[PDB]
Structures are given as C-alpha cells and as structure tokens.
C-alpha cells in the first residue's frame, strides 16, 4: 500500500545541535537514536509544526521522519574560539569542545595551584623565621649582610 | 606472506597498512568492511496471533434437555441454557413453552490472518558473526569476498588468505528473548508457553504456524440467548494481539545501541562499530617485487599546505622528493594522526607530489613513508566551518588533539611554576638546616 | 520562513515578484502513472490564522 | 515441560512443575554425534581442519 510521505524537515546547524522544523500534514512519528554506546533514543508523535533540537555529537545521531528514509548526521568539532590566542580565548575554546573537562581542568588546576601555593609560601616563611630567630634572638652581631637582605633583616 | 594487524570495526573506514618484507619493496594493504553481521542463534517458541471465536451452531432440543460434553478444544465453553422458547420465519421453532432447552458452544482458533501477520517470540543466544571485506594489495584491484569472523576461518580473497576475527567486543543488541514482528524486533520478555494471560500478549500461542494445540486463554463466557432469538451470545477479552501492536511502544530497529541496523532473514544485526577486529592476511609472493627493480626516493621534504581538521580530508601537502628513477610507489601515514586519502605516488626524477590526508590534530606532526624512506611533515590546522556533516569521521581523536601550542605552553608553565615554588621551597630548607648545622657545630 | 508567515509575500496584491519560499519538492511519479507528486509545507498564512 | 510456569494438564490435575534446581548438563559447547554415540569434541572450526 501507498504510504504518506512527509514534509521533508527543514534542518538548520547549530554547533553540536541539530535544529529541524516540521510541518506534518498528518501526525508523523519522528525517531532519534544516537549511534554511541548510550542510544538515548527519543520517540515522539508530531502533529503540530514544531521545532526540535536533538543533540548531535562526534560520534553521531539518526533520526527518522515519518516515512523518510533514516538519516545519519556527525558534529564536526566547530566550536568557537581562538586556539593560539589570547588566555580567555583558549578558556572559551575549550569550553565548547569540552564542557566539563575544562571546568574540571580549571577547578584542579587552581586548586592545586593554590594548594602548592599556600605550602611553599609556609615553607617560605618557616624558613625564613628559621633564617632571622638567631640574629633576632643576639641584640649584638655583625649580621651576614647578604643574609640580612635574603630574608627581611634590619642589620646593625 | 603474513601479516597480523588490529583494525577498528567501523564500516566503510578503510584501514590501510604498509606490508614490509625483507629484501622486497613494501606493498600497500587495504582492508575495509562492507558489513559486519552479528546474527544470532535463534529458536521459536511460539507464534502469537488474534483469536476467532468458531461459535458453531447451537443445538436446540424441542421438549427435552440435552447435556455439555466437553471437547478438547482451545477455550471450549459449552452452556445449556433452558427455557428457551426460539422464534424465526417460520415462527414457532418448538411446541414446549418452558421445557426447552439450547446448547450453545463457543470455542477460540487461530484467525485466518496468523498466516500474514503475527508475532513470532524467539530465544536466541549466540551466533556467528559474518561479514564482506575488499581488500586491496599492491596493482591487484578490489576483490569484495565474504568472511566468518570467527579468527579460524580462511577467507580465499582473489589469491590472498584473510583470517579475520574474532570480535573484541562480545556485545549483541539483542536478549535472551525477542519477538520479530513484520520487520521489527522487540526485546519483549514474553511470557512463557501456556501462561500468558487474557488480553496483554501471547493470549492466544501456538508453537508453529500449523499446531492443532494453539493454547488459548481469552475468557470466553457464553451468555444466554436472548428471548425468542436463536443465537449464540458469547463475552470475551479483546485479543491481546491488537492490545500489543497499539501499546507497543519502540521496536530495536530504533532503541538499538552503536547504529545496528536490524535485518530480519536472516535475524541479524549489522554495521554496528564496536569493539576492534584482529585481522591476518597472507598476500602472495608474486605481488612483492624485488628491492632493487623499484625507486630510491631522497631529499624528502614535506610542506603543508592549507589544513583543517575536518572530518574529511580536509589536509593538503606537498613532498619534494628528489628521486632515482621513474615509477609508482606507495605512500602511507602510520603515525595515526593523519589518514592518508591516496595509496600510491608516481614519481619522476624529481619534483614534487601532493597527497590529501584527514586529521584531528590542531598540529598534525606524522611520518609518513614513501617508499622506504621517511619524512615528518608537520603544520597548523583551522576548525572546519561546518557544524553538522552527513559523513563519519575518517580519523581519530586521542585526548591530545586539541592542546594546541598555546594551551601547552601554558600546561607547562603552571605545572612548572609549581614544581619551582615547592622545589624552591626545600631548598630553602635544606639551606636553612645545613646554616643552622654550621653555626652550632 | 516556509510555513509560519509570509511565506508567500507581494508586494502589492497584482504584483508579479511574489516571493515564496515553501520548501517545493517534487517526488517521482508513481509506476505506470502520469502525474506529477509533489510535497510542499502547509501554507504559514493558515497557521497563523 | 520442566520451566516452573507451564502449567500440564494431567488428568483432572495441573502440575506446574520445575524448574530444576541446578543448570547441569552433560554437553559441553561442541559435540560431536556419530551414529547412536555423542562425543564432548572441542571440534576443529570450519575451514581449520
Ligand atoms: C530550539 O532552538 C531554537 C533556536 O536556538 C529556538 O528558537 C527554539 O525555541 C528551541 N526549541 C527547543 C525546544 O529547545
Ligand atoms: C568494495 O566492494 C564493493 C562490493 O562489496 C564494490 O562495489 C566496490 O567497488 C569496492 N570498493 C571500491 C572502492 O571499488
């Protein structure tokens, strides 16, 4: 038997979205699966004219249209930003490549900064309290005047 | 001549490779998948279909009672209800008002359309997995054989033996138990024969298309006669059957993890990239030539021209390659960085040639062998514009394609600011213990 | 667009530019049939009536 | 049959019997059956032999 044939969808590209405009004359089932390990397929009853914005990523997504052929699409690694600039364009960069691996990054990569921060400034300091106690500690001395300016030192 | 080697079971990705043998020049191997098919083992348990319910003629008994006999039939109900004064055309059917008595039977059977549509529940565990391969070997063209991918079996390839197999990954989309509808399969845990109930699925079973034993349970309950009307009323459960088709919800043809696509006859599933396939070709001896009948290419120096990383090949170079004689000659990338799009070169005495090649890469730094010889090429690559394409990728990302110099540097320059605060940090205690040590002693 | 509004648009109601955008797409006849399928989206002036 | 659901009708009786306690069985993955005996071959796959 012959079988309505939709509206072919009009299909526009975001980064890492596809947006599709449907206009059914009968109410159409539209289908998507994604092709990794996780389908998350999504399974809908479209009656109205809609728009929809599956997620397409690398490792790709198909989608069905009423009585269409399946179609197959992959996200390109598009995003925006400038790679070979200024910090906060990198910053950007990887944020849309990666969403939460940079704010991870970030996150473990200031913390620890901080974290090795903050110890070798205490060791800093102990060995500086370590370096001036004794001189503080002889009223009286001829003070190692190279010493005196390495740490903070008030010679005589 | 051996050659082992694993590729990535993505289909229509060729993987090429550079078959060296001692004392003869390289011949250039390409392997691609047409179509992998992991097809089950099944076997059939039943066959669900609507019901019919064959209600034969009542047997109507004038002046006297006549009693049920039961008959070894699916759902047979048989009800004798009395009282019963029946009128049609002729008007008066029995003389007795009250004493009258009308045996109305009723009984399910498998409806004329289970021959067309019908649900069929399987149990499959484990099959082979199959598959065609082209393979191409030196000036010996595409040859397009089909293959067990079982790692055991032989495949005779033109004149070269290809053990394929056996897949990395065991993973099927399909469970222990499916039902194959028309062209859809559905992971449906199916009730078991001679249990299912009256009206969701496998109401009415029988093991094969043609079974006399078609167990049925749709709650047929005969009904009594209406006043003066000879028929056979009966109640019944609607069939489970339309029940399903219309709740139903999603076959696996759709739902199916890493882009199988399910055929039904063989049941299988097909071209779905997971896992890697080991491989072993054995090329014959006449592809090889001999190492001296074939160029020395030198002064190999590789610039590339414009580059994106792009899922196609979206990468041009361009090799000097100041050579000996004249002839064709293989070029292959196996860095994995960089797919090459062209297999062979033809080379003059000198100049230049230009290969397309694929990438990931914001720098892609790979060798790529010409010949014998070798070159690096590296460069700079722009995003590709496009967001969404209609074609897989022809590479590979590997977690390190997207530093870029910049972001490196900057990787570098904070692991390293800590590492000299701490390292700076214990050697200034080292210094204080070793001035403090020298004072007191 | 093809199909929310102004779909078809003139600039006067004689005019001869007539800008319509709505997604025309001719399908192949059927076997053994003289006609001519084609698939089109809903007109956009009716939905938004 | 032996599965715990399948209900037989035996007489005027309905036995729901097993399912068995333990999944023994006395065949392994490949055999081997010759005339009337069955052998427990670890068989040479086809195309090896
Ligand atoms: C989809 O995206 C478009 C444009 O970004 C927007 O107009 C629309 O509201 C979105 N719809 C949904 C359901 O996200
Ligand atoms: C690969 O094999 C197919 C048939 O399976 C054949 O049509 C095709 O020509 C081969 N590849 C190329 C590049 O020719």
Redesign the interface.
């Known amino acids: 038997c ?1 079988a309505t ?1 939709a ?2 969808p ?1 299909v526009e ?6 947006i599709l ?1 449907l ?1 059914p ?1 009968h109410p159409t089932l539209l ?1 998507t ?1 994604s ?5 998350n ?1 999504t ?1 809908q009853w479209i009656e109205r ?1 809609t728009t929809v914005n599956f997620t ?1 990523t ?1 490792e ?1 997504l ?1 989608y ?1 249209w009423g009585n269409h052929p399946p ?9 925006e930003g400038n ?3 200024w ?1 906060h364009e ?1 910053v950007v960069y ?1 944020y849309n ?2 969403p939460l691996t940079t704010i991870i990054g970030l996150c473990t ?1 200031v913390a ?2 901080m974290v ?2 903050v ?2 400034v205490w ?2 300091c ?2 500086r309290n ?2 001036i106690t ?1 001189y503080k500690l002889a009223p009286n001395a001829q003070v190692p005047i190279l010493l005196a300016l390495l740490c903070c030192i008030k010679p005589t | 001549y051996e050659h082992t080697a694993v590729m990535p079971n993505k289909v229509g990705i060729p993987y090429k490779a550079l078959v060296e043998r001692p004392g003869y020049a390289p011949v250039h191997l390409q392997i691609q998948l047409v179509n992998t098919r992991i097809i089950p083992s099944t076997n059939l348990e039943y066959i669900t279909c609507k019901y019919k319910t064959k209600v034969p003629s009542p047997v109507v008994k004038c002046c006297g009672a006549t009693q049920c006999t039961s008959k070894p039939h699916p759902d047979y109900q048989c009800q004798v209800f009395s009282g019963v004064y029946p009128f049609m055309w002729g008007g008066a059917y029995c003389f007795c008002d009250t004493e009258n008595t009308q045996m109305s039977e009723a009984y399910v059977e498998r409806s004329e359309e289970c021959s067309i549509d019908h649900a069929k529940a399987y149990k499959v565990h484990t099959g082979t997995v199959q598959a065609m391969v082209n393979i191409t070997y030196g000036s010996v063209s595409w040859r397009s054989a089909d293959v067990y991918v079982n790692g055991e079996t032989p495949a005779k390839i033109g004149d070269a033996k290809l053990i394929i197999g056996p897949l990395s990954s065991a993973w099927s989309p399909f469970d222990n138990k499916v039902v194959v509808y028309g062209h859809e399969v559905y992971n449906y845990d199916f009730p078991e024969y001679g249990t299912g109930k009256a009206g969701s699925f496998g109401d009415l079973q029988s093991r094969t298309s043609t079974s006399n034993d078609l167990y049925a349970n749709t709650n047929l309950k005969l009904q009594r006669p209406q006043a003066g009307i000879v028929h056979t009323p009966f109640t019944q459960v609607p069939s489970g059957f339309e029940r399903w088709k219309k709740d139903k919800g999603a076959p696996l043809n759709d739902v199916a993890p890493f882009g199988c696509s399910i055929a039904l006859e063989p049941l299988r599933a097909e071209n779905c990239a997971v896992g890697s396939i080991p491989i072993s070709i054995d090329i014959p001896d006449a592809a090889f030539t001999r190492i001296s009948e074939t160029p020395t290419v030198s002064d190999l120096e590789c610039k590339i021209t414009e580059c994106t990383y792009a899922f196609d090949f979206g990468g041009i170079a361009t090799v000097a390659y100041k050579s000996s004689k004249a002839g064709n000659c293989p070029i292959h990338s196996p860095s994995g960085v960089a797919v090459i799009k062209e297999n062979d070169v033809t080379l003059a005495e000198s100049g230049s040639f230009t290969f397309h090649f694929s990438t990931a890469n914001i720098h892609p730094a790979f060798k790529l062998q010409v010949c014998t010889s070798a070159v690096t090429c590296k460069g700079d690559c722009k995003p590709p514009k496009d967001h969404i394409v209609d074609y897989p990728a022809q590479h590979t990302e590997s977690f390190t394609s997207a530093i870029s110099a910049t972001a490196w540097s900057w990787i570098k320059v904070l692991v390293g600011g800590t590492s000299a605060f701490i390292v700076l940090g214990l050697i200034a205690t080292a210094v204080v213990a070793l001035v403090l040590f020298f004072h007191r002693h």
């Open positions: 012959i044939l509206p072919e009009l590209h975001k980064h890492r979205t596809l405009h206009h004359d289908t699966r092709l990794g390990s996780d389908a397929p399974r004219p397409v690398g790709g198909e069905t179609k197959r699409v992959w996200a390109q690694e598009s995003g790679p070979h600039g910090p990198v990887y490549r990666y990569c620890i900064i090795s921060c110890t070798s060791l800093l102990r060995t370590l370096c004794p």
